[PDB]
């Protein structure tokens, strides 16, 4: 399914952005 | 205690490095 494929990939990208965000914060505080 | 502190900070960087590697591999 094409909408499901876009959605699953987009969520994975969102989860990775959040991880990077949490990592950068750890190297600050 | 300085050696213990260095290892604990190293463990945290390794965990971040390892998650970074999973992201790059995952984006294949
Ligand atoms: Zn469809
Ligand atoms: Zn997106
Ligand atoms: Zn889900
Ligand atoms: Zn966020």
Swiss-Prot record, chain A:
Which regions form coiled coils? none
Q: Where's it found, cell-wise? A: Cytoplasm; Cytoplasm, Cytoskeleton; Cytoplasm, Cytoskeleton, Microtubule organizing center, Centrosome; Midbody
What does the tissue specificity note say? Expressed at high levels in lymphoid and hematopoietic tissues.
Origin superkingdom: Eukaryota
According to its UniProt entry, the function of this protein is described as:
Filament-forming cytoskeletal GTPase. May play a role in cytokinesis (Potential).
| Oligomer and partners | Septins polymerize into heterooligomeric protein complexes that form filaments, and can associate with cellular membranes, actin filaments and microtubules. GTPase activity is required for filament formation. Interacts with AURKB.
Q: Which family does the UniProt entry place this protein in?
A: Belongs to the TRAFAC class TrmE-Era-EngA-EngB-Septin-like GTPase superfamily. Septin GTPase family.
Q: What is this protein called?
A: Septin-1
């Amino acid at each position: 399914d094409t909408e499901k494929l876009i959605r699953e990939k987009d969520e994975e990208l969102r989860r990775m952005q959040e991880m990077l965000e949490k990592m950068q914060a750890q190297m600050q505080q």
